[PDB]
Subunit: 161 residues, 4 copies
């Protein structure tokens, strides 16, 4: 089933702040804001953890779109191959979720990777979820138009928190 990160890293505070640092030309900013809130909320409603949005400076969870090298040890690689990545809870880069600007992202109304599903998978990592062996789980290692957390996802996040 589900998995966590080596050593079960998790957010230790009752509240975790997040910030959408950069956006994509593929969608309106407000759309990304709403979808990010929804992705967070689907994990959030299952656990004793609260998220607070900030719009400047540093937050526990820094979310953004970027092309190529962007300040961490995992530069993006253009169209295709890697699509996004996120880091387990912790200080610094810990918890951050990055999306490769060189793909095509959609709110479901156009062609593209479904951003809501992608954000839910990545933010799952940002909360401490590893990959699942259950094909129905959002945390399954491979990639949406209509979904919800699977029982395995809920079981895993509740186990961690």
């Amino acid at each position: 089933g589900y998995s966590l990160f080596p050593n079960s890293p998790k957010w230790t505070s009752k509240v975790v702040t997040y910030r959408i640092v950069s956006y994509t030309r593929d969608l309106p900013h407000i759309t990304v804001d709403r979808l990010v809130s929804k992705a967070l909320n689907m994990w959030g409603k299952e656990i004793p953890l609260h998220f607070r949005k900030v719009v400047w400076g540093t937050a526990d969870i820094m979310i953004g779109f970027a092309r190529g090298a962007h300040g961490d040890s995992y530069p993006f690689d253009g169209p295709g191959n890697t699509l996004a990545h996120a880091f387990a809870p912790g200080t610094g880069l810990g918890g951050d979720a990055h999306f490769d600007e060189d793909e095509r992202w959609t709110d479901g109304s156009s062609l593209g990777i479904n951003f809501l599903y992608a954000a839910t998978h990545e933010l799952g990592h940002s909360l401490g979820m590893g990959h699942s062996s259950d094909p129905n789980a959002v945390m399954y290692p491979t990639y949406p138009q209509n979904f919800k957390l699977s029982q395995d996802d809920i079981k895993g996040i509740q186990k961690l928190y």
Copy 2:
């Protein structure tokens, strides 16, 4: 000569809807709309199948331009290499035709891949045509300024429909 898809998939309804979901900066939207209609019509006039254009939501044939990964298992790969792809008739991704935004497309007045020819080849796949061994056929596996369906193309599409 011509070929179909393994198991002869084809549209079973008298009418098939299509939608141009995303466009290219290389051309005016209306130009893409017209060229898509023409490509469809060249296959359409030869068979008992009708196409209806829609401009929102899902249609049987979803047509669009995209860079990199875009929601299916065949992400685009930047400039060069793969130029486009389309799927045989069926539910979901079936029938869809995608074009790589990282190439240069033309209506024939500039440098670029001839979009009308490319669309006619891809939509051929969207209708259930495989590749032909006849060099004169639009469905020949390799890539326009002035063409029409070859006798092999017509023979194949009529055989399927």
Copy 3:
């Protein structure tokens, strides 16, 4: 020294038309127009051949910038690697000169590949010049801020025309 193309292809008419089909965001259109004229003129003043500019349809020498695949059998390849190519005199693609939009081009006032030098090298091919073994020649196989045709370049073009 200099070389021509296998079989000495050359323009057989007294006048050769040319058209700048597509431009680059790196420079003003008029700048590209002027630099192209200058590149042509440096070869032109040495031979009994005249060039006439056209701004629509097809011309003997079609000049343009493009990203990735663009209608011929040599798609561009993104930043780096191939920078441009041109074809020996002849019908169709013959004589055409293409420049990869994924590099940086300059009129000499910024960072970039010197477009005047690049255009002079490519249009050399468009006129029937092959590569030279003389390092001073514009037609040397490898890549400008201040130059003129070398004696080898002049000797070669005059030999062909």
Copy 4:
């Protein structure tokens, strides 16, 4: 510790001019101007060398952003891999510092490679500094939100000047 370039190239004049030739869409021009001044000044305050900014033509130190091939023998390579490069003091390309437009650069307020740190490392090369074996040094070979020259950096630059 620190290293210089083979043969200790260095600026021999009391004053060295610099010009920011091209900018990045990632940041305001003035921001790049300020950060470049700061990077120069951190090396400058430690040595008997003065920098003068120019805004046209050629300067000893030409600074700029570029995609792909850009006029030297080291074309950039798209997102990832090489991020930037600079040349040791000397005529022509000597002293120049180039940054790959295909990455993401930041002033520290967004996602991206920290431009101030990157500029300080590259301009270090432009002044004649090689790579250091000291992990605390800005000149360490690998890649920022809050830094200053390390004692090794200062020792090295003072040794050269």
